[PDB]
Amino acid sequence: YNSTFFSTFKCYGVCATKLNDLCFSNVYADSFVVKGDDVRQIAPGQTGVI
């Protein structure tokens, strides 16, 4: 909370508020770098070059 601030944070299939008191079975993290106008393409049902 006092180090990193996110311009985008959105969750699908769950709610963010419940994330504190819920336990997850298998978790994977995928990481990369895009430009700003492409950050809206990382979502289900989108089209574009990314």
Added chain:
Amino acid sequence: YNSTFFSTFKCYGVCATKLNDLCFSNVYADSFVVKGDDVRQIAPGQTGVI
């Protein structure tokens, strides 16, 4: 429509087009200042420092 212009304006419960033709009961205004990427936390069902 002449001086003040808003980057964010979102209504919950009603339609903005129906903001006219309608007459309200008990209106309260809460005012504060945040930074640029915290404005997306002022919504129902959000998590974060704000």
